[PDB]
Design a protein around this ligand. Structure first.
Ligand SMILES: *C(=N)[C@H](C[C@@H]1CCNC1=O)NC(=O)[C@@H]1[C@@H]2[C@H](CN1C(=O)[C@@H](NC(=O)C(F)(F)F)C(C)(C)C)C2(C)C
Ligand SMILES: *C(=N)[C@H](C[C@@H]1CCNC1=O)NC(=O)[C@@H]1[C@@H]2[C@H](CN1C(=O)[C@@H](NC(=O)C(F)(F)F)C(C)(C)C)C2(C)C
Lengths: 301, 301
């Protein structure tokens, strides 16, 4: 019993973290096989960052300009190329600690574990959700770029995120491991804004099943609702429309607890219009949308 | 920028997790050098657990009765002994992945990272605080016993906790890595109760410094207070007395932000008597006491 914001065991990813230094700039890199992946603003000076021309900056660099360090060992760079906003540095040594891996592009609403690094040294691990406006509510200081977001399926590490920037609102933005940003952001030091964020409805309902599995069941009411009547009520609260695909994903939890998805929508509909009346759910006073149905099935089954 | 409940990178501990099976019972073990540490109720049947005599159960066992598995490899047990509520099994192979380590007894109020395991396989990592009533608010299913709590000082793993039980209230109890329970609990399946829990005052103030470092500063008032006048007001809210030792520990944060500890106590005193008036601090609607001053200095400096 018990429900906690859990992160994946980061050990497989720790063995891949390297420190990439170019000129005076130092950030983190992901060393998988004979290639190191890192944000392309490692080739920037502080003056360059206000408006950089990464293609112009990179042509002026050679393999020896990049200082890659794996612990105390310096890895000799034998090739370099840029894929969108990521820089790939081929090295003479393949990582013996390289786990089984794939590079995926997560969808908004899905979660991942962030392994926060500084100087190629992991410092901490925490769980994040890719918001519908394509930002994450992380905790990143200077030098944290190149810290990656990942999920673990038994023995396979699916890397889905690489840290690049922090917005004026405090939220964090980054790319997939192919260099493509999540959201309409560019890697230049200029004022940038994220779109309107919405509440991930399927995650709130999944978190309500986790609450029932844990004995918190005061919000359970006797009514049912239609998917259409739930979406009209939830619309004014900035809740994304719950689709049939979301109802299908909620199946395993609904089968386990014996509470139909549409009966749980009627419970949430009351919580939306009437509030919590000073009560808490799973210790929290606010409804939570950062736990996906799979994250709930992971701990509560 | 950003403030998150962060856990230590669990990689060093993952390389120490083994699966200990005796008879039909299977739980986790911590393999450091040539010794495996595990809860002593691995030698119990389900009937034995209501009221066990572990000394009587263990004398009936020999080295071959214990099945220790490190991945696919079975470790041959060449010795066994019981230290309080932990069982130590000497093995013929010393763990090549054993990190630099020490065994510590944490104080109430301090935090640690829990690496949750099942069948000797790590499944997740999360941060816990040892409550003043000696319980933790974890998330443990069946077979999670032997999952350890730890802190990492650069390269040294200080193991401070091992999971044993879940109380009727939902909270979790365990021993240090010497077999001594935290709190007045016994490892038998009987109704057990934890004492009255209190609010860790020094952690609330540390979390208020993290909030100011992050731009959340609406609660900052113009007043100061004495340590004595703060403790009298906080007493009725079930806040533990803030001692001079706590004020000294809060020094680094107070120096960094430029807010005196006694000025932050006056801000908290207002929050205690007047409430939050519908406002949140660091996104939370309730005051938080699970982040120690060192946890704040870790991310916010
Ligand atoms: C990479 N190590 C840092 C991580 C930053 C440090 C503070 N928290 C973070 O997320 N990334 C940067 O410093 C990038 C980098 C130049 C500027 N920058 C930013 O994240 C800036 N933000 C933006 O420009 C904005 F608003 F568009 F997102 C900064 C003002 C420093 C927070 C480049 C090349 C984009
Ligand atoms: C070890 N793998 C489990 C972990 C349990 C499983 C559910 N969540 C947990 O923390 N530990 C046990 O099953 C121990 C074990 C017998 C009973 N037990 C308990 O934790 C029970 N609780 C208590 O007896 C109580 F209330 F005193 F804490 C249980 C009712 C199963 C939750 C022994 C030997 C104590």
């Amino acid at each position: 019993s018990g429900f906690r914001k859990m992160a994946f065991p980061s050990g497989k990813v720790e063995g891949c973290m390297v420190q990439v230094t170019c000129g005076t700039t130092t950030l983190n890199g992901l060393w998988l096989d004979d290639v190191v992946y890192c944000p392309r603003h490692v080739i920037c000076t502080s003056e360059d960052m206000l408006n950089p021309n990464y293609e112009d900056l990179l042509i002026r660099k050679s393999n020896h300009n990049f200082l890659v360090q794996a612990g105390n060992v310096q890895l000799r760079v034998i090739g370099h190329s840029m894929q969108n906003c990521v820089l790939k540095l081929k090295v003479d040594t393949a990582n013996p600690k390289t786990p089984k891996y794939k590079f995926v592009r997560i969808q908004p609403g899905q979660t991942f574990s962030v392994l926060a690094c500084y100087n190629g040294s992991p410092s901490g691990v925490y769980q994040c959700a890719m918001r519908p406006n394509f930002t994450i509510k992380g905790s990143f200081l200077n030098g944290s770029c190149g810290s990656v977001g990942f999920n673990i399926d038994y023995d396979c590490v699916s890397f889905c995120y690489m840290h690049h920037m922090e917005l004026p609102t405090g939220v964090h933005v980054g790319t997939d491991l192919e260099g493509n940003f999540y959201g309409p952001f560019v890697d230049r030091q200029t004022a940038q804004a994220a779109g309107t964020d919405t509440t991930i409805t399927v995650n709130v309902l999944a978190w309500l099943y986790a609450a029932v599995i844990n004995g918190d069941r005061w919000f359970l009411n006797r009514f049912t609702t239609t998917l259409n009547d739930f979406n009209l009520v939830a619309m004014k609260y900035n809740y994304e429309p719950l689709t049939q695909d979301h109802v299908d994903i909620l199946g395993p939890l609904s089968a386990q607890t014996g509470i139909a998805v549409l009966d749980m929508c009627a419970s949430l509909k009351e919580l939306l219009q009437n509030g919590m009346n000073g009560r808490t759910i799973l210790g929290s006073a606010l409804l939570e949308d950062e736990f996906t149905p799979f994250d709930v099935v992971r701990q509560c089954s």
